[PDB]
């Protein structure tokens, strides 16, 4: 209990696992714009992606709201990982 439960798995749901999750999620969202030599082409393609993607999402989303929850979960997965 003192090793595998209290120092083991109650820290994985606590301060030791959250540090690793936030380390990975922060690394991914900082490397979101690591790629291109260009500042301007990067950001102006990034503006295009969202005003396309949001419009596509609401096109899905007034049809049915159930089929757009996993789309947003997958967008969070590729954004934070």
């Amino acid at each position: 209990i003192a090793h595998h439960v209290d120092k083991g798995s109650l820290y994985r749901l606590g301060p030791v696992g959250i540090n690793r999750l936030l380390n990975k999620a922060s690394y991914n969202v900082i490397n979101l714009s690591s790629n291109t030599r260009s500042s301007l082409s990067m950001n102006s393609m990034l503006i295009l992606i969202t005003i396309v993607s949001l419009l596509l999402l609401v096109l899905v989303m007034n049809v049915n709201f159930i089929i757009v929850i996993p789309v947003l979960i997958s967008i969070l997965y590729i954004l934070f990982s």
Binding site: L22, V29, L32, S44, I47, I49, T50, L57, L72
Partner: protein, 469 residues
């Protein structure tokens, strides 16, 4: 009376030499003070939420917008004090904190364009004022042109502001194509039911909001805030935020919007976990602005959000202003000055600040715990009154995402504290020259507001009750 100052000022500045610039700013500083003191009795016009429209339904003047212009003048008095007063009389701080000849011109033209957004009733007033303040931020960014980073930042800000201004123009003329009108006073509670104005009004709000730095399109603004020098970036971070958000809160065109709720959740997420592993203090300091603009995107969904808004606005303004002024003051104690425009960059450079001027760390700790929302301080009641409006109106998942975002954002706020209360080997004992009396009094005023401003909450709620209801 801003117009008078601009008209007087460019006349006066064309004839001054460059030796006189700093003193000119001092003049304008005192001028704005006597526009606050001698002219604020106009609050008596706005009893019981009496609203005026001026210039033929062109501008709208209520008490909300009166408070916003008072706030913008107070902040301009602080910023112009930062330019017009010396920190120290060294040959160091003269080559670091030096105003250009045309800096206060662009300051007052930007304050003009920022006021004509919040005071605006029609869409072409909104457009002309947005471009007035946008060209002013282009030129305020580009005015320290002997700098590679500020030049690249002004070019980037030009193109990314041009796109999002053409998106606002497209939304305005798209609104015009379905309604022969320019007002949102045209809407009047029945048209929204029988007309799909959703896509129009949301695209308008989005084109207005991407200039603040909301989350899908946030990185270009974080790069502009890191690349600009340390005095410019305290002004260009604050003024478009409060002007555009004070427009979009006064006009309630995105009430219960699904897109604004998506982007508010995403803003609270990416600002909290975005600035965690970051080692530059203006980066760290700009993701704080990203989260605190998320907390406003929340109030955009709201109907009747004027208390939570105005309280959290002057909260964030005082806290923002103070945390930039504290790291202006910490430049005297760092062992390494690079980069003449931006002399402190890395947040580990303030490492032994408790052993050199411990009361600067008392200052810092107060404003950082108010950023977190600790109850004796003023940021707590801002977050509290935002929660009282979020929960009143049915945004239950948004509430828990707000709480998790504030808990995650507390980490990199406390990282400033964790660095500054630490051991350092070579500490100061005896320093000959002093910090500015005029300018350290301003930082102490900004702290005493944050700590002892919870006293006046009930007075402020009663004065609220009379002038807005």
């Amino acid at each position: 009376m801003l117009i008078l100052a601009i008209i007087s000022l460019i006349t006066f500045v064309s004839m001054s030499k460059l030796s006189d610039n700093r003193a000119i700013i001092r003049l304008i500083n005192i001028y704005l003070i006597l526009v606050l003191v001698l002219d604020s009795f106009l609050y008596l016009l706005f009893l019981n939420n009496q609203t005026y429209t001026v210039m033929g339904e062109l501008l709208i003047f209520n008490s909300f917008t009166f408070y916003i212009d008072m706030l913008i003048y107070f902040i301009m008095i602080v910023i112009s004090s930062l330019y017009g007063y010396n920190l120290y009389n060294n040959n160091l701080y003269k080559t670091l904190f030096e105003p250009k000849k045309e800096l206060i011109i662009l300051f007052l033209i930007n304050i003009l364009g920022a006021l004509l957004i919040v005071h605006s009733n029609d869409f072409i007033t909104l457009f002309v004022a947005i471009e007035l303040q946008s060209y002013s931020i282009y030129l305020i960014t580009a005015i320290y042109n002997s700098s590679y980073k500020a030049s690249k930042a002004s070019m980037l800000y030009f193109f990314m502001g041009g796109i999002l201004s053409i998106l606002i123009a497209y939304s305005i003329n798209t609104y015009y194509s379905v309604l022969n009108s320019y007002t949102l006073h045209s809407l009047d509670s029945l048209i929204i039911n029988t007309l799909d104005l959703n896509l129009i009004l949301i695209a308008l709000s989005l084109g207005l909001l991407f200039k603040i730095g909301i989350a899908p399109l946030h990185k270009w603004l974080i790069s502009i805030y890191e690349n600009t020098p340390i005095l410019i970036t305290i002004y260009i971070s604050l003024i478009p935020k409060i002007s555009i958000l004070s427009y979009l809160v006064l006009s309630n065109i995105s009430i219960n919007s699904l897109v604004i709720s998506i982007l508010a959740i995403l803003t609270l997420l990416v600002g909290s976990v975005g600035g965690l592993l970051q080692i530059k203090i203006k980066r760290l300091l700009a993701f704080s602005g990203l989260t605190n603009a998320g907390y406003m995107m929340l109030l955009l969904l709201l109907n009747n959000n004027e208390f939570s808004y105005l309280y959290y606005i002057t909260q964030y303004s005082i806290s923002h202003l103070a945390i930039f002024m504290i790291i202006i003051f910490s430049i005297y104690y760092i062992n390494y000055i690079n980069n003449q425009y931006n002399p402190i960059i890395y947040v580990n450079q303030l490492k032994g600040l408790i052993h050199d001027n411990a009361y600067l760390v008392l200052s810092m700790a107060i404003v950082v715990f108010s950023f977190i929302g600790i109850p004796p301080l003023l940021g707590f009641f801002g977050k509290l009154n935002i929660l009282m409006s979020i929960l009143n109106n049915g945004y239950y998942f948004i509430s828990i995402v707000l709480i998790v975002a504030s808990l995650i954002s507390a980490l990199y706020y406390l990282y400033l504290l964790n660095v500054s209360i630490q051991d350092k080997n070579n500490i100061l004992i005896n320093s000959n020259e002093t910090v500015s009396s005029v300018l350290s009094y301003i930082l102490s005023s900004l702290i005493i507001l944050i700590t002892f401003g919870f006293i006046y909450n009930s007075l402020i709620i009663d004065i609220f009750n009379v002038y807005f209801n």
